[PDB]
Symmetry: C2
Subunit: 381 residues, 2 copies
């Protein structure tokens, strides 16, 4: 077989994830392909009678009717549905990709929103601090056999704080703390993640990189989504890649006796949990007081709480409630505790990485592949 090495174009990448994910519940939605329709979720009254094994005992349980007790919360409202317009968004993106540039002017710029940041590897180190912090609040440990799943979280987090081109992400030009993306894929193989699970997580990452890049490369896209609230939420969940991170978290945390994690068999519960965590994050950040948001911000908040309570209740009865309830609601404890968000409250500064944290993070840095400008990161590690 002749050795071909051409990096796919963004158009070909888009086509590839279209073919892999297929359509969601709307025809022509690929690759925006969720099967759960958030707008149709129903909330059932709680009878108060629960078995010890009931899923309500996992995660954080805050009933809808109790939310008025908390001033930072309140009442809920069903969101308007524009989800059936998804085919129009995909058609628009197909057209844009016929003449899209492979590079943007600000590629490589820091976008963390914290003026202290001047080195992109230092930003990656902070993102790695955050990635282990999320992993822990989801229920995970720091054992060495999950090293590369944690690196995956880092790759999922850094595109928000550093502008990365999908091409450079794919072809090894971009490195996260010295790691190429292929290093993560190869590492997941060394850890024993099945090839099918790796490729699902891989395609989710492709989709994240593409959708986040389109938001910056195509000036028509965000205006097109901003006015379609329910659709913007679908899109934001893809740019957050909570689904890909969840798949690998489940692989690390699931009962060994249980079979491998297949999205084909568990898409419903995984999608519900991925949406719940995104909504919880936005809930918690707003409540604490730290543009994609459109229209009346007060109404958008009532919609998030509507979605949150229904996502969480549905997760009560799902086969993996024992992981997905906590994944869905973890923002309620990780946002108040994590430096990432406390730094923003404190005038968007940077907390020092003390020696204990630095020693934890040291092994995640491939110092041999860093640029000379970054050889001195994590010095106390």
């Amino acid at each position: 077989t002749p050795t071909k090495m051409a990096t796919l174009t963004t158009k070909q990448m888009w086509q590839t994830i279209k073919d892999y994910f297929g359509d969601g519940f709307v025809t022509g939605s690929a690759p925006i392909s969720y099967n759960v329709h958030t707008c149709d979720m129903q909330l059932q009254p709680d009878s108060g009678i629960h078995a010890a094994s009931d899923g309500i005992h996992y995660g954080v349980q805050i009933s809808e009717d109790s939310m008025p007790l908390f001033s930072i919360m309140g009442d809920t409202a069903a969101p308007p549905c524009t989800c059936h317009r998804v085919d129009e968004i995909v058609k628009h993106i197909d057209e844009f990709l016929e003449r899209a540039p492979e590079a943007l002017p600000d590629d490589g710029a820091i976008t963390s929103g914290k003026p202290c940041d001047t080195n992109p590897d230092q930003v990656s180190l902070y993102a790695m601090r955050d990635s282990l912090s999320w992993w822990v609040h989801w229920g995970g440990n720091l054992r060495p056999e999950h090293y590369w799943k944690q690196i995956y979280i880092g790759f999922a987090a850094i595109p928000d704080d550093v502008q990365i081109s999908p091409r450079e992400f794919l072809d090894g030009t971009y490195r996260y703390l010295g790691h190429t993306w292929d290093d993560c894929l190869s590492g997941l193989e060394e850890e024993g993640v099945s090839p099918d699970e790796i490729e699902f997580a891989n395609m989710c990452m492709w989709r994240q990189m593409l959708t986040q890049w389109l938001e910056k490369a195509d000036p028509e896209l965000l205006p097109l989504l901003k006015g379609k609230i329910s659709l913007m939420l679908q899109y934001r969940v893809l740019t957050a890649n909570t689904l890909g991170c969840l798949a690998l978290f489940m692989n690390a945390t699931a009962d060994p006796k249980d079979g491998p994690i297949h999205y084909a068999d568990s898409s419903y519960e995984m999608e519900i949990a991925s949406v719940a965590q995104c909504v919880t994050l936005d809930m918690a950040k707003e409540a604490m007081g730290i543009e994609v948001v459109a229209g009346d911000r007060a109404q958008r908040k009532r919609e998030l709480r509507w979605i949150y309570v229904r996502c969480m209740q549905i997760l009560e009865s799902q086969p993996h409630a024992h992981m997905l309830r906590r994944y869905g609601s973890a923002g309620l404890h990780y946002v108040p505790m994590m430096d990432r968000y406390l730094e923003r409250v404190s005038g968007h500064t940077r907390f020092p990485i003390r020696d204990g944290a630095a020693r934890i993070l040291e092994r995640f840095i491939n110092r041999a592949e860093l640029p000379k400008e970054s050889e001195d990161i994590n010095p106390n590690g």
Copy 2:
């Protein structure tokens, strides 16, 4: 049987809870009678292999070794043990009670620490807001069949914000939102709580009222406890009455098929969970930045985290992990969300009770038994 109506003296109350609780793990400790020795707890390494039914999946899971990732957390340190001095504390209290006054000068004064508070029934209303807020974050609902268990939480919370004499608490002179203590006991009977469970919760409340009153009535007591850290913690857990509140929460939340909640059969897990919640509260309040604390506050914090992680790990394997893990760690999400603590951050003000919260709280007020000065509380309810 001749009708006798004399209110017990504080000495007789003390004797009664001594006879009821008996000794803890130290001889002569009654009624400071915990059987678990916090100082002896051991932390086991996590193998990372867990069944779906493992208790680690309940509550919030933050491993000890991950805590350095969070600037507001850090490392841990084992506390020094003075628990075997408990007999000296009880002996001292026995002597003080031989000539103790039945009334203190500031009895009836507001002690909430929020200058806005001028009416003790309004303070009780705010405490009721908080009581339902704690109940919800523990996992409970607002269903009417748990009304009087929630009133119990209110009685457990108000002694911190209003100075109450044990005599007036007992004999019906003190009313919480128009409810006497006997009204709560009778209400718990109407709700179907077994007599033995009610009397356990009752004795826990007696013990809370006595121990909190002794701290103010006996100027020698706090100096005696302050220097015995591990003992002060035992005492503070009794003044918080997390054990009594837990017993009734479990009654409301437990599997119906399971038997009644008997402290005689479940004291170990209940004590561990009661300690964990108190330690979590203090952890979370300090981390957020809101005197019993003695010596080097930095060291005391390392001790709290030591106790927290060991309490939580032990709860993984207990029969009621499916309730007690969340009870133990709930402070990690209820402290950031509850008005009680947000008010203190905001210059110890009072957030308005909006119409939604007021409508929730209305049924907990017995307006027929309020003093005329308080007839206008919760007007929007």
